[PDB]
């Protein structure tokens, strides 16, 4: 579910760690 500090698809806000994916469109989970 998105590696630590990994890129996110956007539609999938299910980011286990570290916290949440932002922006909800395209960015990095922090």
Please give the method by which this entry was determined.
NMR
Contact 15, 28 (CB under 8 A): no
Checking the chain for breaks where C and the next N are over 2.5 Å apart, the residues before them are: none
Nearest of 2, 3, 4 to residue 12 by alpha carbon: 2
Strands, DSSP E only, in 1-30?
21-22, 28-29
Residue written as token pair 């286990």: 16
Q: How far apart are CA 7 and CA 25, in angstroms?
A: 10
List Cα–Cα distances, 26 to 11, 14, 16, in angstroms.
9, 13, 16
Q: Are 19 and 1 in contact (CB under 8 A)?
A: no
**Rounded-to-integer distance, Cα 15 and Cα 3, Å:** 9
**CB-based contact 26:12 (threshold 8 Å):** no
């Amino acid at each position: 579910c998105i590696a630590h500090y990994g890129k996110c698809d956007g539609i999938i806000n299910q980011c286990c760690d570290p916290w949440l994916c932002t922006p909800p469109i395209i960015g990095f989970c922090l």
